[PDB]
């Protein structure tokens, strides 16, 4: 039973799929990153490499009645192939809950199961939302080409908005305009909803309607900085090798230890889609 | 197999399949002018011409007991027969993401589709916007009888919806009013949100009310300019021979390039329900 | 049932990732079990013997 | 528009630009390849070097030394090398009709600058994109190759190199490879008795001494031939395709995909 | 329902098949030790211990009319029996490799292996030429009795053939004769493969022929030494437990780490075979 040890697998199917489902439910809720971003289908375990495609191109396209006009059709700057790294953390079981969940507690225990998932989806995000310079990546905030504006004139509500307003107009003119969205830090997100006298209407309420895909806040940005995308595909991606799955590693000590995994890659495969502070 | 080349398709059904759905996507992502005009029926692809029909027409419509009173049907001022001009976009497949893609990622990259579609649909956004005087064509901003109105009084907000309250006076005048809508330039959609002191409520939800069918946001149109126009059929139709559609283009360097299509006409069957700055 | 793992105080472990996937980090496990007991919560209420009578003819 | 040729002419092409190749190629005879992968895959896989742990515990039990794995995962793009030619028609026409040859002069060129091409990327990596030269490896062991144009000369600059490989304890079976000036002017036959020092040479490496004209004036290199070592990942031998007809003239391209990935740059000497 | 888990051996049998003669070819290339030698044949994994014989004897045969010589050459007091160790290094193979191996890109990689399993042969050899005094165990450059002879005289054109003359004289002054062989460093080696020695050809074919058993090249050795010793058994051996095999040690964080194992133990008989700088 539980003696000869180091079994293929010691759980059961329906103890499996209550961790899966744990560990996606918790995903779901504290991804901000996933949520403005197309993800790639997903590839499969074995692929380690996608296309890092683009860095720039331009086609206006024009229309004729014949239909011979000639415009040169965006293929590619020049490819990159980066590897798809992995995203992991770990937690534990202690071999009688487990056997105490098939007589006594019918439903397993797996709590631990989420505050693993929390982990490893906060250590997405950062992922997302900031390279690591050991492998070469790129961030959201650390892209070259970000198209900076310095927006530093707050704790007055005449203004705030108008860096926004300044983003948009910097997105605009390199020709890139679309749903555009927000993604702010907490010590802005809060300041925003300031209810300074004269209020009027809340400068949140305006942000949102000038964005149309959501102003959210995620702690793992740094404390004084926030950023201007264009939700659409061909600009952004998200190369999904596979999602959050939960694996074994053996059976040390006699307890049980599990990984909860993925392997994500952002890809922006139209770096001026960006707006920085 | 790969080396015969010049095959009559190279993609197979699931690939035709993800590229026609990447491109609906972002086309139906991407256009506003299809969200205020009701569309014609697919015609097909062999038609090139449409009734391009009305310029004008009133008959009151009365009422009586026996339904006796001889009034004019509103047939046609004269048939004219415009011709459907093209819009399209092309891009590139490296002819071995496409081999790739049927071993090791499943899910074939098409990010290429998506930056065309998205060009195309940007192109039929500005004829739609703007005729182009190489095809005798007529735009919303270049149509003649436009009811322009001066509304340059704006960075004050003791005003600015004023313009709108004047052009649908004017529209009312010419006897023509319903479900208004609103289509406004960046640089006055961001002004619309501005939060100066004694706000109260933004401007843009009076307008939202006031329109009934939504105040949108184009980047097509010119810098300094927006219209108000009345939804309904009658007024402004949108002869499509056939929407998006990818189609190949022989093999060329032994690379596969695409052309993304569609065949579009506006037709304005009243140009009186228009106003312009 | 009548016991059930008060199970945690504390526990951080950033989590890192790397290409071929070796960090090392500690999973959280537990700071030690406790494992608290169950009370019951219960109220109580009255029935007139005779409106459970009535409910089979009258009163449906 | 269409597709040109039949299968004997087909077959006729292909066996012309085998022939060019396998003649050509000096590379195949000294490296062996990863088989054959398809033309889908795009990235390899990359080296593992300097595990530097003596492993050699010898301890009843075992002790926990580290174990050798890749230094720093990483992947490669593996190049496409192509020659374009042309053909004509109305010669199609001629060689179905008139005469039966089928001239394929311009296959043959194509062939033969597809392997120079290869060749050169193999001893010389593109700067430009960014690849692992023979001559410009990192870690390369140089060795002093001059003072030659004496009697005793290669031989005196090829047991330094050997000497030097077996003091990084990387042996085995060596195989050399010289520009074409020494590999001709290195036959001063007298060593002292009878045999041709490129034949003392020969029998001291034991898996060849090659030429290719492709090497610089008075370069040379000696590497340990077996696999694990250094490798030749292919995607698709040389193949020749139709690029489509275009203003009725037929065009041709000749394709290969190689790529080398040395994994243990510790088998080299030079200048 | 897949890969994930602490299961059994992950590999296939075909690609275990391929790891053991890896494993063997690199060993037999890598070998400089078991050439000079010989090995009693392959005990067995259990045999831990094996007979260690006492020391030289310097009685000889004898005839005579009729045998009445007793011929005693009889071990004393002990036999000093001795254990043999195990030498071992690692393969940290990645999953996903093993992944890409099965549905896609499959050339196996096993270079880590070969990479090992050189670094295990190079210390097994290190092991023969040199003990280590942690385990107590004896040295051909180490034991007792190597009847030292200076050098003192290379870097000439000819300084190399009388020093193995008199070890060879010195070698049989003991009494103990027969094929020798010969083990040098490096650079030594080299510099012995130098120009013609005045009087014929290269040195080395003279020394090959007085030795008759050739001269062999060990890294593994020190700057400026070498030995010629006795090629036949009665004066040494390799005791075999078990020869080079790769076995599966558990299963890493999620990668597979291997282990090659071999089990040596040089038994100098007659430590009067033997002769160094």
Same mark, same amino acid.
């Given at each position: 039973?539980?003696?000869?040890?180091?079994?293929?697998?010691?759980?059961?199917?329906?103890? @499996?799929?209550?961790?899966?489902?744990?560990?996606?439910?918790?995903?779901?809720? =504290?991804?901000?990153?996933?949520? %403005?971003?197309?993800?790639?289908?997903?590839?499969?375990? #074995?692929?380690?490499?996608?296309?890092?495609?683009?860095?720039? #191109?331009?086609?206006?396209?024009?229309?004729?009645?014949?239909?011979?006009?000639?415009?040169?059709?965006?293929?590619?700057?020049?490819?990159?192939?980066?590897?798809? /790294?992995?995203?992991?953390?770990?937690?534990?079981?202690? @071999?009688?809950?487990?056997?105490?969940?098939?007589?006594?507690?019918? &439903?397993?225990?797996?709590?631990?199961?989420?505050?693993?998932?929390?982990?490893?989806?906060?250590?997405?995000?950062?992922?997302?939302?900031?390279?690591?310079?050991?492998?070469?990546?790129?961030?959201?905030?650390?892209?070259?080409?970000?198209?900076?504006?310095?927006?530093?004139? @707050?704790? =007055? &509500?005449?203004?705030?908005?108008?860096?926004?307003?300044?983003?948009?107009?910097?997105?605009?003119?390199?020709?890139?305009? #679309? /749903?555009?969205? $927000?993604?702010?830090?907490?010590?802005?997100? =809060?300041?925003?909803?300031?209810?300074?006298?004269?209020?009027?209407?809340?400068?949140?309420?305006? %942000?949102?309607?000038?964005?149309?895909?959501? $102003?959210?806040?995620?702690?793992?940005?740094?404390?004084?900085?926030? $950023?201007? $995308?264009?939700?659409?595909?061909?600009?952004?991606?998200?190369?999904?090798?596979?999602?959050?799955?939960?694996?074994?590693?053996?059976?040390?000590?006699?307890?049980?230890?599990?990984?909860?995994?993925?392997?994500?890659?952002?890809? %922006?495969?139209?770096?001026?889609? %960006?707006?920085?502070?």
């Amino acid at each position: 039973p539980d003696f000869l040890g180091h079994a293929e697998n010691p759980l059961r199917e329906e103890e @499996w799929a209550r961790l899966n489902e744990t560990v996606i439910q918790v995903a779901r809720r =504290s991804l901000v990153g996933r949520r %403005i971003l197309d993800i790639y289908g997903p590839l499969g375990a #074995g692929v380690q490499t996608v296309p890092y495609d683009e860095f720039q #191109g331009v086609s206006p396209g024009a229309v004729d009645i014949v239909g011979e006009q000639e415009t040169a059709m965006v293929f590619t700057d020049a490819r990159k192939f980066k590897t798809i /790294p992995i995203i992991y953390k770990d937690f534990l079981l202690h @071999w009688r809950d487990i056997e105490a969940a098939r007589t006594h507690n019918m &439903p397993l225990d797996v709590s631990a199961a989420a505050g693993a998932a929390a982990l490893c989806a906060q250590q997405e995000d950062e992922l997302i939302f900031y390279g690591d310079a050991r492998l070469g990546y790129e961030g959201l905030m650390t892209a070259n080409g970000r198209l900076t504006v310095p927006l530093g004139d @707050w704790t =007055s &509500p005449g203004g705030g908005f108008q860096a926004i307003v300044e983003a948009t107009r910097k997105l605009n003119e390199q020709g890139h305009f #679309g /749903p555009y969205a $927000v993604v702010l830090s907490p010590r802005l997100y =809060s300041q925003l909803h300031r209810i300074y006298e004269k209020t009027g209407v809340l400068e949140i309420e305006t %942000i949102r309607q000038l964005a149309s895909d959501g $102003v959210y806040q995620s702690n793992r940005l740094r404390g004084e900085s926030g $950023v201007v $995308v264009s939700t659409g595909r061909e600009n952004m991606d998200l190369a999904v090798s596979m999602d959050m799955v939960a694996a074994y590693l053996g059976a040390s000590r006699m307890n049980h230890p599990f990984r909860v995994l993925e392997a994500l890659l952002l890809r %922006i495969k139209h770096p001026d889609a %960006i707006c920085t502070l």
